Amino acid sequence: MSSMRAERVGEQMKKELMDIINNKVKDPRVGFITITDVVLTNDLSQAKVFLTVLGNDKEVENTFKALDKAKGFIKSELGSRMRLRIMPELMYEYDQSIE
């Protein structure tokens, strides 16, 4: 479940998503939102977006809801930055790997 195409598109989405989310979606009263990786399926139909977010357990959960609420806005801004015709479905995941 990782062709070279999928890895390359994921690096572009990582960069584009971090910009979109931090400069246009995020409440200024919360810290930066770090995207550590974007992992796509080979047909690019799904993207798992791994995240580092700052705060307590409820600030983490408040942040996930804001991003889910903004999914239409985020796919649209992403689609306007990439020749890709149909956007993947975006799934926001906490990055367990990091303590």
Indicate which CATH number applies to the domain containing 27.
Answer: 3.30.300.20
Separation of alpha carbons 63 and 54, rounded Å: 9
**Structural tokens at position 37:** 């990786």
* C-alpha distances out from residue 33 to 28, 42, 43, 62, 83, Å: 11, 26, 27, 13, 25
User: What resolution in Å is listed for this PDB structure?
Assistant: 2.2
> Residue 61 carries which side chain, given as an amino acid letter?
E
The total number of structural domains that make up the chain: 1
Backbone Cα Rg of the chain: 13
Instruction: Decide if 3 is inside a domain.
Output: no
Q: What is the DSSP letter of 91?
A: E
Separation of alpha carbons 37 and 18, rounded Å: 10
The experimental technique behind this entry is X-ray
> Residue 59 carries which side chain, given as an amino acid letter?
E
Q: Which domain holds residue 51?
A: 10-94
What sign has the CA pseudo-torsion 20, 26, 32, 36? negative
